[PDB]
Ligand binder design. Structure first.
Ligand SMILES: [Zn+2]
Ligand SMILES: [Zn+2]
Lengths: 382, 379
């Protein structure tokens, strides 16, 4: 992964990651987001509706928690997961857990980690994990790691120290297995920075993982309800200060626009796009503006509300997505009252398109050195 | 002012290749008409349904009467503008607890409350607000004795009242619905009375009630033998592939059924050999498409094995893929039927369809062998 930075304005890395994919003819702009999927499909959207969206990222996120139970099927398929799900043209980064439905904690030992899918729990040793990545053949994949020291409950220093040692032991095991397979060497391993909420362990995880020949870094354990806390925001800064500038920085569980801008300032490049999915699932549409040249959040409207029963305007005036060019709020409101699946389809198209256009404004603002105005415009809308 | 042009006929049976001239475009016949109300509920956009070649679909008058109501549909520039459907639409009368009097159909309110009277006049007014290209008369549908004949004559009187209330025949086409149930004498009477009315089209009602298949196709053939040759024949509630092929041979032109949308939710995908139950274990490693001959987006992109994976997950897209394909199967079948009529090879087409569906002709359904033989198609 040859990463090239255009500039670093106020700690924000503007650049592009070149020569990606099997043919090495793909690029990814940073900062950016990945296409969110579930069982290898964008939620509510087939490959046909997915083409109706402008600005779809070139790299899509897969989750082992949705694909691990299909290990035997993909092994017999042999041709890789991207071809199996009918998206051979896209890049794929396979993460360990789904950010919205991760499953319960307490199944991490120094011998195995468990993920959770529709069929149930899948227990993966390092052998089993690399055997599954061999069938998936993703472009990138998160290395098996221990991220359960970062939890809401009172966590211990010994537990934070364990997550660093356990993830490193996992990392070194996966690297030894990777070099023993022709297929697996085509994929890129992503180191995972752990350490819980203990500063010494966070910094030790960042330095020790950077010593490995990983192609990038996943910043794990910084999720926050309702958003990333000030304590973990400072932890994130200290970690990224220990990482090379020439490798991408990914983060999981951070998708809301306010905390995205907060983490870009800390030097984080790539984000998951599960926030527009969450907005869709509650029957809402993102309406927050990001133009800098002129359970539900304030960035959205709830179309189950009776005030849209006669509202014949689009979700967002001037939006170029399929829903806003062809349908009205009243139609979306009607589909939600009659529990029709077209509501989830039309809402997801807009919420993805609006979200992807938000990431265009971030890269545009970094070109013009105006992320301050953009951050204040996003935050003034809470 | 005929709305149907006959393009080709089978020189051996009653099959008709035709074309409907409707305000939102022309429709090739024979045509299966999906229920668009269930399609959108299935998660299929207008662009997808259009890309499948569908040029006419149904809307449910009673459902739209409950939500969002005809007042909002009017404000939304009719049903076309509401769902943004550019092609043709057909709506039912809205009649089918419900008591029936000469005034109309009576709807009770749950847990007491004011009733709602749906007269023939109000059915036309409601359907006029929806703006569909074809509208259906209000009829008196019964579930056997004096009530069958009583309801048939009321359906005739209600037909005259719908014709009088329908003041814009240039913008909406009103269809009569043949009643009589399975009684040949009553159905023949209703055919005699209703064909005297100047309606652009005719529909065959009361033939999806659980009757025997022998009485089914015989009531179809009795209807098509007395319906005008220069107007379309609409058989309601018929969607199974065999029934379509057989009833085209009996002279029907239009069909509707919730069947393709329904089984898509059950994991089943329609194929020339019947259906594939893609939720079952046997398709977990089947890396072929549903049908390599199907042009739909699902069959051009995805395998049975991947759809099997989606069916064993929380992904709603599993239903979208199958709903797309099943509708495409219905359209592909009826267009292949139409090509065989244009190319004067309809009986050979029927023999090949039956052979692929059932195998040896002795395994074909007995009712279908009799119905096809009645119009000169042997197996
Ligand atoms: Zn939009
Ligand atoms: Zn298909």
């Amino acid at each position: 992964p040859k990463l090239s930075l255009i500039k670093v304005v106020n700690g924000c890395r503007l650049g592009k990651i070149q020569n990606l994919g099997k043919a090495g003819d793909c690029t990814v702009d940073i900062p950016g987001c990945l296409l969110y999927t579930r069982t290898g499909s964008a939620p509510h959207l087939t490959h046909q509706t997915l083409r109706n969206i402008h600005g779809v990222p070139g790299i899509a996120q897969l989750t082992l928690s949705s694909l691990a139970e299909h290990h035997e099927v993909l092994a017999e398929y042999k041709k890789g997961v991207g071809s199996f799900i009918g998206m051979p043209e896209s890049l794929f980064y396979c993460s360990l857990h789904d950010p919205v439905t991760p499953g319960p904690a307490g199944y991490v030992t120094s011998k195995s980690v468990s993920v959770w899918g529709f069929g149930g729990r899948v227990e993966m040793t390092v052998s089993k994990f690399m055997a599954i990545q061999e069938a998936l053949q993703p472009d990138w994949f998160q290395c098996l790691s221990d991220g359960e020291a970062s939890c809401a409950e009172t966590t211990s220093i010994k537990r934070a120290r364990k997550s660093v040692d356990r993830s490193l032991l996992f990392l070194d095991s996966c690297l030894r297995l990777q070099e023993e397979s022709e297929v697996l060497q085509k994929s890129v391993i992503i180191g995972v920075i752990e350490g819980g909420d203990v500063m010494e362990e966070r910094l030790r995880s960042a330095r020790e993982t950077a010593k490995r020949p990983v192609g990038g870094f996943l910043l794990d354990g910084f999720q926050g309800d309702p958003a990333v806390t000030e304590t973990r925001l400072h932890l994130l800064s200290s970690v990224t200060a220990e990482l090379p500038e020439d490798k991408p920085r990914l983060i999981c569980g951070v998708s809301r626009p306010d905390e995205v801008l907060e983490c870009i300032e800390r030097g984080v490049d790539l984000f998951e796009s599960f926030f527009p999915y969450q907005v869709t699932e509650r029957g809402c549409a993102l309406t927050f503006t990001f133009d800098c040249q002129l359970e539900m959040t304030s960035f959205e409207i709830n179309l189950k509300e009776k005030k849209y029963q006669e509202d014949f305007d689009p979700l967002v005036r001037g939006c170029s997505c399929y829903c806003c060019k062809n349908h009205t709020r009243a139609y979306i409101h009607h589909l939600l009252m009659t529990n029709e699946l077209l509501a989830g389809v039309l809402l997801m198209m807009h919420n993805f398109e609006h979200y992807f256009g938000f990431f265009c404004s971030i890269r545009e603002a970094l070109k013009n050195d105006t992320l301050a105005q953009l951050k204040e415009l996003i935050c003034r809308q809470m | 002012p005929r709305i149907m042009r006959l393009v080709a006929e089978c020189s051996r049976s009653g099959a008709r290749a035709g074309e409907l001239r409707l305000p939102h475009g022309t429709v090739a016949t024979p045509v299966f008409m999906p229920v668009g109300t269930q399609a959108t509920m299935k998660g299929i956009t207008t662009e997808q349904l259009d890309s499948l070649g569908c040029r006419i679909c149904l809307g449910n008058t009673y459902h739209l009467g409950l939500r969002p109501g005809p007042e909002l549909i009017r404000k939304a520039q009719g049903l076309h503008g509401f769902m943004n459907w550019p092609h043709n639409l057909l709506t039912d009368s809205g009649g089918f607890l419900s008591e029936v009097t000469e005034e109309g159909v009576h709807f009770r309110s749950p847990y007491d409350g004011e009733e709602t009277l749906l007269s023939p006049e109000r059915s036309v007014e409601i359907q006029n607000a929806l703006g569909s290209d074809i509208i259906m008369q209000l009829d008196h549908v019964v579930s056997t004795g004096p009530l069958v004949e009583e309801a048939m004559h009321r359906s005739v009187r209600w037909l005259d009242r719908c014709i009088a209330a329908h003041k814009h025949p240039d913008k909406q086409n009103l269809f009569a619905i043949i009643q009589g149930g399975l009684n040949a004498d009553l159905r023949t009477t209703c055919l005699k009375e209703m064909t005297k009315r100047d309606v652009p089209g005719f529909a065959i009602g009361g033939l999806s009630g659980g009757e025997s298949k022998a009485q089914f196709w015989k009531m179809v053939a009795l209807s098509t033998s007395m319906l005008p040759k220069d107007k379309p024949r609409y058989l309601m509630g018929v969607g199974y592939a065999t029934d379509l092929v057989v009833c085209v041979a009996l002279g029907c032109d239009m069909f509707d059924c919730v069947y393709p949308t329904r089984t898509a939710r059950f994991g089943s995908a329609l194929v020339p050999t019947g259906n594939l139950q893609l939720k079952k274990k046997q398709y977990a490693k089947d890396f072929s498409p549903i049908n390599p001959e199907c042009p739909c987006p699902t069959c051009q992109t995805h395998s049975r094995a991947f759809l099997h994976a989606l069916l064993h997950s929380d992904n709603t897209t599993a239903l979208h893929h199958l709903t797309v394909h099943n509708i495409a199967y219905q359209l592909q079948l009826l267009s292949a039927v139409r090509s065989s009529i244009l190319e004067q090879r309809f009986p050979d087409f029927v023999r090949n369809f039956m052979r692929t569906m059932y195998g040896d002709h002795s395994l074909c359904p007995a009712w279908a062998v009799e119905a096809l033989a009645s119009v000169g198609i042997m197996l």
